[PDB]
Design a protein around this ligand. Sequence first.
Ligand SMILES: [Mg+2]
Ligand SMILES: [Mg+2]
Ligand SMILES: [Mg+2]
Ligand SMILES: [Mg+2]
Ligand SMILES: [Mg+2]
Ligand SMILES: [Mg+2]
Ligand SMILES: [Mg+2]
Ligand SMILES: [Mg+2]
Ligand SMILES: [Mg+2]
Ligand SMILES: [Mg+2]
Ligand SMILES: [Mg+2]
Ligand SMILES: [Mg+2]
Ligand SMILES: [Mg+2]
Ligand SMILES: [Mg+2]
Ligand SMILES: [Mg+2]
Ligand SMILES: [Mg+2]
Ligand SMILES: [Mg+2]
Ligand SMILES: [Mg+2]
Ligand SMILES: [Mg+2]
Ligand SMILES: [Mg+2]
Ligand SMILES: [Mg+2]
Ligand SMILES: [Mg+2]
Ligand SMILES: [Mg+2]
Ligand SMILES: [Mg+2]
Ligand SMILES: [Mg+2]
Ligand SMILES: [Mg+2]
Lengths: 141, 150, 83, 129
Amino acid sequence: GKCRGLRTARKLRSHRRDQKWHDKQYKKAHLGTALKANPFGGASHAKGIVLEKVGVEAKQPNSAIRKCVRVQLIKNGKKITAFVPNDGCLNFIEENDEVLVAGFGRKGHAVGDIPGVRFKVVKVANVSLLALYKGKKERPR
Amino acid sequence: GRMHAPGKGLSQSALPYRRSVPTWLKLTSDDVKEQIYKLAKKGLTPSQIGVILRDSHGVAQVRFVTGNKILRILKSKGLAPDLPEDLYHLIKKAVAVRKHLERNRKDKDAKFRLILIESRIHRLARYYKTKRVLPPNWKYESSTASALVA
Amino acid sequence: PLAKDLLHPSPEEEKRKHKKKRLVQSPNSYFMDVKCPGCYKITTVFSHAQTVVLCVGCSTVLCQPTGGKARLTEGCSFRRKQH
Amino acid sequence: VRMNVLADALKSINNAEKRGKRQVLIRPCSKVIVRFLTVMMKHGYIGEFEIIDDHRAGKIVVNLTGRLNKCGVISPRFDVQLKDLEKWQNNLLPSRQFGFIVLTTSAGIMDHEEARRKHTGGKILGFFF
RNA sequence: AGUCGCCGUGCCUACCAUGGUGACCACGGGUGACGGGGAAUCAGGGUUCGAUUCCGGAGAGGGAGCCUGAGAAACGGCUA
RNA sequence: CAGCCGCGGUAAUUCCAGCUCCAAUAGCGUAUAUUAAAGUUGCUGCAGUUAAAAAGCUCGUAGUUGGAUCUUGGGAGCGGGCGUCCCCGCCGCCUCUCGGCGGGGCCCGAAGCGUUUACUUUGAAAAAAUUAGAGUGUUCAAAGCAGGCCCGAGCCGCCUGGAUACCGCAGCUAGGAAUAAUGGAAUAGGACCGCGGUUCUAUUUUGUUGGUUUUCGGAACUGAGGCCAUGAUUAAGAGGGACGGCCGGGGGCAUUCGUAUUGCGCCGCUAGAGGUGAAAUUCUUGGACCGGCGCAAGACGGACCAGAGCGAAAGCAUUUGCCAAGAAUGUUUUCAUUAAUCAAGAACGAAAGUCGGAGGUUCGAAGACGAUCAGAUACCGUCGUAGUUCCGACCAUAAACGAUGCCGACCGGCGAUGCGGCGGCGUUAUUCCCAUGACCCGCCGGGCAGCUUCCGGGAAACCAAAGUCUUUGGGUUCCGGGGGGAGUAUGGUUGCAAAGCUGAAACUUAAAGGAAUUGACGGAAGGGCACCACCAGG
Ligand SMILES: [Mg+2]
Ligand SMILES: [Mg+2]
Ligand SMILES: [Mg+2]
Ligand SMILES: [Mg+2]
Ligand SMILES: [Mg+2]
Ligand SMILES: [Mg+2]
Ligand SMILES: [Mg+2]
Ligand SMILES: [Mg+2]
Ligand SMILES: [Mg+2]
Ligand SMILES: [Mg+2]
Ligand SMILES: [Mg+2]
Ligand SMILES: [Mg+2]
Ligand SMILES: [Mg+2]
Ligand SMILES: [Mg+2]
Ligand SMILES: [Mg+2]
Ligand SMILES: [Mg+2]
Ligand SMILES: [Mg+2]
Ligand SMILES: [Mg+2]
Ligand SMILES: [Mg+2]
Ligand SMILES: [Mg+2]
Ligand SMILES: [Mg+2]
Ligand SMILES: [Mg+2]
Ligand SMILES: [Mg+2]
Ligand SMILES: [Mg+2]
Ligand SMILES: [Mg+2]
Ligand SMILES: [Mg+2]
C-alpha cells in the first residue's frame, strides 16, 4: 500500500520525482532530445527556400495527390516537406520564392491522410497567399 | 508471529485473578529462600527452580508469597551466573550444529538454520548491552565460545 | 444472532472455551493431595506436573509425566479438594 | 501487529452496527476510548457501556441502539491550527448541521464546537455521525 | 608564535598533531539559471512563469595591474 | 475538403459557386508554449487475480512505525430553564538560602520559573507598490486620492481625510498541559539546630591598635547517628528461551531387499521374428524369436498413493542404524517491550548447460537410413553420439502460478479430514478386570482444503476474501501510466564461455486489449432426416 506516516516526506517527494519521468509529455519537454531534434528551434514559424515541387500520395481508402514542396531553411540549413492548402494554388509558386511555413495543428504529429507532413505554407513573397487566393491582392512581379 | 518461522500458535499460560495465598500452604518465605539457595548451589536455572516448587511443594508464584522475583533474590546474595539463561542456550545450540556441520558439510538445512540462530543472537545482545548487563565490547566470535558453554 | 447478553454467559458456556477467550481468563489446573498407601504422609501435587516425584522415603514413585495431565501408580488416591 | 488501539475498535463497532447487532465487545480497553465513547453517548448516539476490569489492558462492552451510520478514525494524529477547521470539516462531514470531529487538546477531549467556544485547537483523532 | 590587514579569522609564513565530508545524498556534471516582493490559472489542495519601472548583486570588447580621493581595482580615469 | 469519425468512383446534406440561415461584433480567425478539464502522476485522491503491473524464497543495516499503566471525581463564590443540565474564580506547590511592597506582619523580581522539548493560544516585530477591502456621483467605468460648506463672496475663511486585513517556514515573549519522546533511588539515596572534626578563612565583634585562635560565611576532606509506610507498575489472545510426551514421503552418512531390462554360458524343439494404417530398413539353419537353470553390471523404487502429510521455497517415498535441527499442543515455570516491515549487503535456488575424475544397462538432442508426400533436410519405423548416473566446483533462469506481498483485527452457517490435549454410555482387546489404537458421541486450538447464501463487493467471470472504498486514512515494502521500436543500441558490472543485472532515443501508429452475448464455422461430441445421399439393383 501507501507509506502514510507523519515524517515520510522525503520518500514520497522522491518517489514522485523518479516516477514522473514515465509520463510521455513531461519526459518529452524537460529533455532536450525532442527540442534539439525539432527543425524549429522551439518556435512557431520559419522562413526558407524552395528547391523542388513534388506530389505526395495518400493513404489507402482515399486516393489523391497532395501537392507538396521540398524546402530548405535559412538559419539551420535543414530540409523538410510542406503542404499548400487550397484549390489551384501551387501555380502561384515559382522556384526560389522565400516562403513562410508553420505547423499544422498536432504539435509534431502527422495529420490526416498525408504520409509524413507536418508543415504548411502560409506566405509566399510576403503577400499572404490566402488573400491572394481571394483576389484581394496579386503577387509582386 | 514466530519471528523466524510461519506458525501462529497461542499455547501459553493464564495466571488467575486472585493474587492471594490460598491458606492451606503453611510454608513461609524465609523457608522458601532457603530452599532456593540450596537449589542454586547445585547449578539450576530460575525456571528449573520454579517448576520444582510448583510440582512438589505447592508454590504457584514466588512473587506472591515473597514480594520479589527469583533473579533479584539470587543477585541479592551473589549467586546469579555470569551470562543470562536465554543467551546461554542459544550459544550452546549453535556450537552443536557447527560441530555437526564440521563433518557433514553437505547439509543445507543446517546452514540455513544456523544463520537464523546467529541472527537471533545479535538482536538479543543489543538489548542486554543497551540495558547495561554486558560490557560495551562483548561480542560473539564463533571460534571461541565453545568454551563459555561447557 | 442480533441479540444476546455477553456479560452473563452460561457457566456451561464460558467453561467450554479457551482459557483466554473467556470473558475473563481462568486457569484450568488444580493441586491435589495424595495418599501413598504404603505410607501415612499426604504430599500435594500439581495436575500437569511434568516431573517425577519420589516419595518421602525415596521408596516409590507417584507421577510419571505426559504431554498433558500426569498419571498415578494405580494404587494411589488423590483428593482434588483445594482452596 | 496492533500499532493502534483506537482504530480497531471503531471498525468493530462499525461493522457490527452495520449488520444489526445490539451489543459488542472490544478488547484492549484503553483510556482514550473511554473519553471518545463518553462524548458520543453524551450527544446521544449510543447507550451505556460497562467496562470490565482485569489486571491487564482490560475489556469493555457497549450497548448500541444502532441509530449510527459510520464511526471513523483519522491517523496519523494531525495538528490543527484553529483556522483550518472549516477546511477539515467540510470535506469529512456530510453537512453543516450535524456530525462531530473529536480532538484532543490541552483542556481535554472535546468536539470541535466546544473547542471554538473555548478558543483553542489541538490534535485530531476521529469523527462520527 | 608572528607578518600583512581599518579590525576577528590558515588570509599568509615556520614548527607540531592527523584529521574534515558522506546514502538525512557529500563530490561531479546540466540548467532555455541573477535572486526576491510578485504574475497567470485556480472548488479545496496545487502546476507553471518571473530579463522587465521597487530592494540587493554583477559588468562596461576578453583578460590583468594602478593614480587620485573620505569613499573606485572607476571605465563618458590611466597603463600593457 | 477534413483538429477526430469521415466526404468524392454521374442524382455529392461535406468539393467549386449563387440565394438562405447561424454565432461573436469593431473585432475574428491561424500557429506555438503554458494552466483547468487530468481522480490520465492521485498528500487531500488512482491501480496492481485475468485488461500494463507483487522481486523465486529467506535473513538483514540505515529509514519509517510501535501495546497497557501514574489526580479522577465530590465540592465551591456564582447566572439562566436540598434542587437539576448547561455557564464564570478556586479546593500553578512553596520560595523567607534572600528582595523590601533587636524583632511582627501581609507580597515579589530572583531562587525550579518552569527535567528537556514538540504542540496550541497570545503579544511583539515585519519595507513600500501589488491583492481582499472602507470613504469619495472621476459625466458611469477603468483608474486616482482627493474633497465638501455657507455664502453680498468677507468666511479674508469653516469642516475635513489620506482606514483595516493577510504577510507560509525559522527566530523572540507569556499562558494551558491532553497527545508523542526522554530523566530520576538497585554493588543506594533525599531530608535532620543535622553532630563531631582536618583546612582557607572575607569583616562582625577585640573603641584607634600587634598577632593568634577566635561565634561569624563557603569552599575540599573525613567520622558516628535517628528519620522516610524507607526505593523495583503489572505480565499483553505481543515476543525470546526453558521443560514433558508425541508427530511427520523434513535433511545428511553408512546399510540390507526387490521384480524388470541388457549381455553372456549351457540345454530343447523348430522357420520365421520385429514393427506398421500398410510397408520396408533390420535380425534370421554359422540356429534367430519361445521355453529352462545360472552368472554379471548399472539404473528405478510399481500397485498400497488419497483434492492425505512435511518443508522458507526449490522439492521429499524400499529395510535398518546413527547425527544434529523444527512446527503444533500442554503448562498457576522464566525475562520483561526485548518488537512489524525493510534501500545497501548475504545464504539457498527444478531442467538444460559449463569445468575435472570414476562409470556407462535404458532412453535419446545431433547424425545416417527406410517409408508417406507435388516437396519433408518433420510427424512414423530401425540404429545412434552428447548427455541421463555418482564425487567436487561454476551459472542463477522458468506458466519458479494460488498468474493473487508481509503483519494484525473484524465480519454468516454446515458436514468432514489430519496432529495434540480434555472428557463419556459401550463393544472388542489380552491372558484373569486397567492404562494402546479402533471405532461409537462431543468439545478446544491452530492447519491443507470443501459445500451453501441478496454479508458485501465487482466491467463481469467470480471471490469468507478479490469484503469492512466518494460514509474515501491500521502499519509498512516493491512496482505500473496508449500501442510498437525494445528488454533493442550504447556505457558500466559479474562470469571459464553461454548469458545475467542496470537500461535509452529517433521514428511509427488510432487504435491494440479484457469479460460476456447473438450468429456462422468446426477433419468436436450426442439424437434424428433425405434415392436432387448411400447400400442392393434396373
Ligand atoms: Mg521478520
Ligand atoms: Mg543566463
Ligand atoms: Mg527578476
Ligand atoms: Mg564596477
Ligand atoms: Mg559590444
Ligand atoms: Mg575596469
Ligand atoms: Mg560609469
Ligand atoms: Mg560610453
Ligand atoms: Mg496541464
Ligand atoms: Mg480536479
Ligand atoms: Mg490510469
Ligand atoms: Mg497524456
Ligand atoms: Mg474527494
Ligand atoms: Mg498480464
Ligand atoms: Mg502508547
Ligand atoms: Mg535487495
Ligand atoms: Mg540442475
Ligand atoms: Mg546435468
Ligand atoms: Mg564430464
Ligand atoms: Mg534405440
Ligand atoms: Mg523473472
Ligand atoms: Mg509473476
Ligand atoms: Mg478487482
Ligand atoms: Mg485510497
Ligand atoms: Mg508505454
Ligand atoms: Mg494478455
